[PDB]
RNA sequence: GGUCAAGAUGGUAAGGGCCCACGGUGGAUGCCUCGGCACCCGAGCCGAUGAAGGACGUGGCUACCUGCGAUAAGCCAGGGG
């Protein structure tokens, strides 16, 4: 989702904040899943993690730019 | 053909001995390497932006060899293909 790279570019303080937070929760959802759907899940897990990771890469970039 | 006195030699293995055949355990080993070792050139500083060096982690499903460490089979940007 290079596109997601984009949204990223887009948001800022409280934004990225709750974005990555909620998303994170999402992956939690996954954690839960650890014994249900599973099969097509796989990716929600790996990628989702990579995604939120990005989320952080950004926050860093932005507020870093700041202070 | 039968009886007796005499003499001389024969095969008969439980196992074993030399030989031949055919196995088994044992790895010599001929060769063969992502491994050393030797010389020469290249190279020569790491650390509190808490390093060298490790403890416990993560890989959907992993004790372990791996790479990261809590953003953890990795996110970012540019160089390469």
Swiss-Prot record:
Record-linked PROSITE patterns: RIBOSOMAL_L29 (PS00579)
Q: Per the record, GO CC terms?
A: cytosolic large ribosomal subunit
What molecular function does GO assign, one term? Answer: structural constituent of ribosome
UniProt entry tagged with the keyword Ribosomal protein: yes
Keyword set, alphabetical order: Ribonucleoprotein, Ribosomal protein
One Pfam family assigned to this protein is Ribosomal_L29
Which segments does the entry list as coiled coil? none
Q: Which gene encodes it?
A: rpmC
Task: Give the UniProt family note.
Answer: Belongs to the universal ribosomal protein uL29 family.
Q: Which HAMAP family match?
A: Ribosomal_uL29
Any single GO BP term: translation
Gene3D superfamilies linked: 1.10.287.310
Specify the protein name.
Large ribosomal subunit protein uL29
């Amino acid at each position: 989702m290079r596109k997601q790279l984009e949204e990223a570019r887009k948001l800022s303080p409280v934004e990225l904040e709750k974005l990555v937070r909620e998303k994170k929760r999402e992956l939690m959802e996954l954690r839960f899943q650890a014994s249900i759907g599973q099969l097509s899940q796989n990716h929600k897990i790996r990628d989702l993690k990579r995604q939120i990771a990005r989320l952080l890469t950004v926050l860093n970039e932005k507020r870093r730019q700041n202070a």
